[PDB]
Amino acid sequence: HWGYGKHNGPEHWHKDFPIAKGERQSPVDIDTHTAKYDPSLKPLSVSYDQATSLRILNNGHAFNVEFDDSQDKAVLKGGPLDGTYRLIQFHFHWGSLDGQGSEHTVDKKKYAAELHLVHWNTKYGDFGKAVQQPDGLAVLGIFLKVGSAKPGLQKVVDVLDSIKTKGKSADFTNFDPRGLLPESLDYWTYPGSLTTPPLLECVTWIVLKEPISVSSEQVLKFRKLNFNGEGEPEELMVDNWRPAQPLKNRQIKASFK
Ligand SMILES: NS(=O)(=O)c1ccc(CCCCO)cc1
Ligand SMILES: OC[C@H]1O[C@@H](O)[C@H](O)[C@@H](O)[C@@H]1O
Ligand SMILES: OC[C@H]1O[C@@H](O)[C@H](O)[C@@H](O)[C@@H]1O
Ligand SMILES: OC[C@H]1O[C@H](O)[C@H](O)[C@@H](O)[C@@H]1O
Ligand SMILES: [Zn+2]
Numbered sequence: 001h002w003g004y005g006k007h008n009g010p011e012h013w014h015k016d017f018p019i020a021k022g023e024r025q026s027p028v029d030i031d032t033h034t035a036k037y038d039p040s041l042k043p044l045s046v047s048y049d050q051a052t053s054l055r056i057l058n059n060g061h062a063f064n065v066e067f068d069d070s071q072d073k074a075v076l077k078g079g080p081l082d083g084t085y086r087l088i089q090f091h092f093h094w095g096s097l098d099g100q101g102s103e104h105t106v107d108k109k110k111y112a113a114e115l116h117l118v119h120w121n122t123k124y125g126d127f128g129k130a131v132q133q134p135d136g137l138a139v140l141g142i143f144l145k146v147g148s149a150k151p152g153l154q155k156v157v158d159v160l161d162s163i164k165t166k167g168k169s170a171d172f173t174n175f176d177p178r179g180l181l182p183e184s185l186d187y188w189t190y191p192g193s194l195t196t197p198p199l200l201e202c203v204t205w206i207v208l209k210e211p212i213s214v215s216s217e218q219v220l221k222f223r224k225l226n227f228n229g230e231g232e233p234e235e236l237m238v239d240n241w242r243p244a245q246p247l248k249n250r251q252i253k254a255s256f257k
Contacts, residue, residue, distance in 0.1 A: 025245040026192030027103035038253035044079035053175040060166035085119035096238040113144035149215035152179020182210035
């Protein structure tokens with residue numbers, strides 16, 4: 001199956017997922033000079049006060065922190081969005097070294113990692129129906145650079161030893177995702193896709209301009225995870241990012257003048 005290596009990575013995905021060559025694929029390079037301020041964007045509302053985290057899982061590609069999405073606890077509204085989008089999970093993409101790891105790029109700059117907070121449009125009732133709609137999902141993307149430690153990330157870092165291999169999970173209750181945000185909510189937005197198979201073109205992307213800073217020690221612990229399962233040859237979980245894809249007939253809009 002699909003992955004990130006030479007023999008199953010992004011250059012091979014199109015053979016089983018032909019939408020990989022589609023008209024609204026993600027990620028993209030964000031040309032900051034071309035992006036245009038959009039006065040029609042409404043204020044963005046990140047409402048995570050009542051979030052209920054449940055579990056953290058190594059799925060063989062990344063790790064996901066999963067949330068209770070049975071009711072409108074943690075939601076994203078406003079900005080480019082029509083209606084309410086419910087948080088279901090977050091995960092990261094990262095590199096083998098600090099000079100790469102992000103999926104989106106900014107004037108071709110690659111960051112050390114990228115956080116994706118994944119939300120589904122409640123008008124469609126469940127995540128599975130939402131991924132059959134052009135406006136089914138909203139992903140909030142946040143860049144990570146290496147500098148000072150991020151206190152709100154440390155609980156994640158310290159549980160990774162217990163989910164080293166594919167298929168392992170651990171309880172992860174009472175985690176507050178607000179500790180992963182930067183100060184500013186200035187953002188760029190465009191219509192795109194999932195960045196992993198099945199590559200479905202259902203996503204409104206909201207990419208924050210301000211990175212968060214994490215320490216070298218924090219990202220080094222991400223790089224100790226394994227793509228493989230227990231009892232199998234060790235393959236370090238690094239470079240789990242898709243490169244930028246063609247922009248085609250799209251425009252990136254900015255929330256800020
Ligand atoms: N890297 S991403 O934020 O675009 C992302 C989010 C969510 C999925 C899961 C799709 C499951 C389809 O049934 C896959 C990728
Ligand atoms: O425990 C993590 C978070 O859980 C949420 O349900 C609470 O409302 C927050 O105050 C708390 O920080
Ligand atoms: O026709 C003019 C319009 O062109 C579009 O491509 C831009 O998104 C708008 O901001 C502009 O007003
Ligand atoms: O909040 C996420 C997790 O952080 C720490 O690991 C706590 O020890 C644990 O109880 C909690 O579930
Ligand atoms: Zn992602």
